[PDB]
Amino acid sequence: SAFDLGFIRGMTFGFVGQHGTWGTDEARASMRALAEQPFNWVTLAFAGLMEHPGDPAIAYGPPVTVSDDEIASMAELAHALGLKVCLKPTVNCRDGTWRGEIRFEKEHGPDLESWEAWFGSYSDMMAHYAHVAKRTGCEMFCVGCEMTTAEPHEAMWRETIARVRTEYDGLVTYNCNHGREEHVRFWDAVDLISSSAYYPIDRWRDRVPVLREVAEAHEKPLFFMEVGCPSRSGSGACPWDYRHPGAVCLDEQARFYEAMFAAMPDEPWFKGYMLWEWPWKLYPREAASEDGSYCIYGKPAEDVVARAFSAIA
Numbered sequence: 677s678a679f680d681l682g683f684i685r686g687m688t689f690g691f692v693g694q695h696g697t698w699g700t701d702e703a704r705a706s707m708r709a710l711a712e713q714p715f716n717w718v719t720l721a722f723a724g725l726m727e728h729p730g731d732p733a734i735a736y737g738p739p740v741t742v743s744d745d746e747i748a749s750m751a752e753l754a755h756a757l758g759l760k761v762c763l764k765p766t767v768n769c770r771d772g773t774w775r776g777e778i779r780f781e782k783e784h785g786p787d788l789e790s791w792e793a794w795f796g797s798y799s800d801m802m803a804h805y806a807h808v809a810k811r812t813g814c815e816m817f818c819v820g821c822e823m824t825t826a827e828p829h830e831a832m833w834r835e836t837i838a839r840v841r842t843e844y845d846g847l848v849t850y851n852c853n854h855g856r857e858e859h860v861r862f863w864d865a866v867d868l869i870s871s872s873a874y875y876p877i878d879r880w881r882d883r884v885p886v887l888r889e890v891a892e893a894h895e896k897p898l899f900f901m902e903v904g905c906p907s908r909s910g911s912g913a914c915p916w917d918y919r920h921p922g923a924v925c926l927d928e929q930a931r932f933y934e935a936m937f938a939a940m941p942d943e944p945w946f947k948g949y950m951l952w953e954w955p956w957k958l959y960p961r962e963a964a965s966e967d968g969s970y971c972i973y974g975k976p977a978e979d980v981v982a983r984a985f986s987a988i989a
C-alpha cells in the first residue's frame with residue numbers, strides 16, 4: 677500500500693484556494709499545463725482562516741475558501757488528466773502568524789480559548805474535507821501542515837486522525853515542518869511521513885541521514901509534502917521564505933533543485949517529491965523571466981525537474 681506506493685513526482689496546485697478561484701477558466705487551463713509536466717500527483721491545497729492565533733475559530737468553505745464543488749471540479753479534472761490527487765486543507769491566520777505558532781491559554785474547555793476547542797474546530801474541518809476526499813476519489817489526504825505548536829498534543833492529534841479514518845479510506849499523511857521529522861510522536865497513526873523540506877542548499881547532504889533514520893525508525897516511508905524555492909536572489913539559503921527581498925534569479929531556483937536531487941539517494945524509504953508550487957492563474961512561458969515565485973514553469977528548474985523525474989520513471 678504505502679511500501680510500494682509509486683515514487684511521487686508531484687506538484688501543489690492552487691494555494692491558498694480562495695473562494696471561486698478554482699472554478700475559473702484560468703484554473704482549468706493552469707491544471708491542464710500542470711498535467712503536461714512529468715508529474716504523477718497533484719496536491720489541491722487551500723487554507724481556512726483563523727481570526728487570530730489564540731482564537732479556536734476557523735473560517736472555511738464559502739466565502740473564504742474554494743467551495744466543495746470547486747474542490748470536486750479540480751479533482752475530477754486532475755483525475756481525468758491521469759493525475760493522482762492529494763487533498764490538503766490547512767489553516768492560516770488573518771494577522772499573518774505562521775500556523776506553526778498558534779497557541780492557547782488553556783489545554784481544555786470546549787467553550788474556552790483552549791487547545792481542546794481548537795482541535796474541535798480543526799477536527800470538524802478535517803473530517804469535512806476527508807469526506808470530500810473520499811467522495812471525489814482523492815488518493816491521499818493530508819491531515820495537517822507544519823503545526824509545530826500543535827504537535828505535542830498527541831492524544832488530540834490521534835483523535836483527529838481517527839475521525840479522519842472514519843471518513844476516508846485512502847492514504848493519510850501529516851506534513852511536519854523541516855526539522856520536525858524526528859520530533860513528531862504520532863507517525864504510527866499515519867501511512868506516510870512527510871515534511872516541508874525547505875532545507876537550504878548547504879544543508880541537504882548533512883540532513884539526509886536523519887531523514888533516513890526517521891523513516892527506518894518508524895518503519896514508514898518518507899516523502900516531501902512541500903519542497904521548492906523561489907526564483908529570487910539568495911533564496912536557496914532561505915527556501916521557505918515567500919517574501920524574500922531580491923532580484924528575480926532563475927538560476928538560484930535551479931541551483932536549489934540541483935542540490936536537492938544530488939543529495940537524495942535512490943533508496944526505498946524515500947518516496948519522493950510534492951513540489952511547491954503551481955498557481956491557479958499561470959503566467960505565459962515567456963513571462964517566466966519576470967516571475968520571482970516558487971513556480972518552475974518556463975524556468976531552468978522545469979528542465980532540472982524534467983531530467984530528474986523522467987528518469988525516475
Ligand SMILES: OC[C@@H]1[C@@H](O[C@@H]2O[C@H](CO)[C@@H](O)[C@H](O)[C@@H]2O)[C@H](O)[C@H](O)c2nccn21
Pocket residue numbers: 691692768821822872874902915916917918952953
Ligand atoms: O513560503 C512558501 C510556502 C507557503 O507558500 C505561500 O503561502 C502563502 C500563505 O500561507 C501564500 O500567500 C504565498 O503566495 C505562498 O503560496 C505556504 O505557507 C506553505 O505551507 C509553506 N511552508 C513553508 C513555506 N511555504
